[PDB]
Amino acid sequence: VNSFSGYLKLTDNVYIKNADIVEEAKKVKPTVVVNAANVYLKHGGGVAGALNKATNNAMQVESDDYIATNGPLKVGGSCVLSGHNLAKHCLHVVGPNVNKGEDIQLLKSAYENFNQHEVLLAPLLSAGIFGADPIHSLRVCVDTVRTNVYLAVFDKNLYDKLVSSFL
Ligand SMILES: C=C(CCO)c1ncnc2[nH]c(C)cc12
Numbered sequence: 054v055n056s057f058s059g060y061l062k063l064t065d066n067v068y069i070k071n072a073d074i075v076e077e078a079k080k081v082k083p084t085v086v087v088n089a090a091n092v093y094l095k096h097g098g099g100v101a102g103a104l105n106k107a108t109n110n111a112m113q114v115e116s117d118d119y120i121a122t123n124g125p126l127k128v129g130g131s132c133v134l135s136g137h138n139l140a141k142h143c144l145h146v147v148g149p150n151v152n153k154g155e156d157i158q159l160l161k162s163a164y165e166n167f168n169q170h171e172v173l174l175a176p177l178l179s180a181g182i183f184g185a186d187p188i189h190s191l192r193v194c195v196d197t198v199r200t201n202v203y204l205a206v207f208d209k210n211l212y213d214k215l216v217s218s219f220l
Contacts, residue, residue: 055172056081057203063219067195067202071212074100074176074205075107078139086136087175090145092125099182108137128155129162144170151184164197172201191215
C-alpha cells in the first residue's frame, strides 16, 4: 500500500491520473519523482522548468554542479539527484526530443531507467515540448517499465484521450 490517490489502473504496474506533477509531488513526497530532463540538465520549460521553479532554482544549482563534474547525460540516460522539497530523489531521465531530430527508438532506453526504482511518480517521457506522440509514449511505458509507475498527465484533454484509446 502506498499514498498515491485517485489513479486509474492501466496494468498490473502502471497507473495514470490527470494531475500537475508539481502539486502531486508536493502532496505525496514520493521516494522518486522523474524529471523530463535534457542532456545538459537545463531545466528551462515543460515539466523540468516547472519542477525546478518549485524548488526555488535549487534543482538547477545542483544540476549545474553535476554537469560541471560529469559532463552531459546521454539521450536515453539518467542520473539520480536530490528531490529537494518535492521528493526524496529526482530521477532525471532524458527522452529523445523530436524537435531536435533524436531517434524515437531511444524512448524505450529512457523508460528502462525506471526499472531501477521500485516506485516512481513520473510524466510521460518525450511528451509535451519534447514533441513525441503521448499515446506512443504511454505504450512504450507500459511495455518497458516493470516497476510501479504513477503517471501524472497535466492536460485534462490529453488524459482523457490516453485513457479512452488505451489498449
Ligand atoms: C508534458 C506536460 C504538459 C501536458 O501537455 C506535463 N506533464 C506532467 N506534469 C506537468 N506539469 C506541468 C506544470 C506540465 C506537465
